[PDB]
């Protein structure tokens, strides 16, 4: 039930909702916030040119085998994830790994 407050599922696959730290030293997840049911993400990229949406994208399209798009949050911390034709339990398998 844990990584439960950070998704939900739509017609078209799993809404995750993060919230990232960009310069980090390792692209992974730290956690969890409660209030805003959000999963904390570090991403190893800088804030520039992009870069650190790509590396997020790719971190998960690697973790879930599904390609992933940023819906929502281009430009801000707080982003949601459309993880595409995939289902909430894949993805809470995968996510506790
Ligand atoms: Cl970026």
Redesign the pocket.
Known sequence: LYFQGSLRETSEGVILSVIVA?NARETKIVGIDGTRGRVKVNVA??????????E?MKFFKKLFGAEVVIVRGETSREKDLLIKGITKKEVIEKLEL
């Open positions: 960009p990229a800088p804030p520039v040119k992009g870069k650190a949406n790509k997020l």
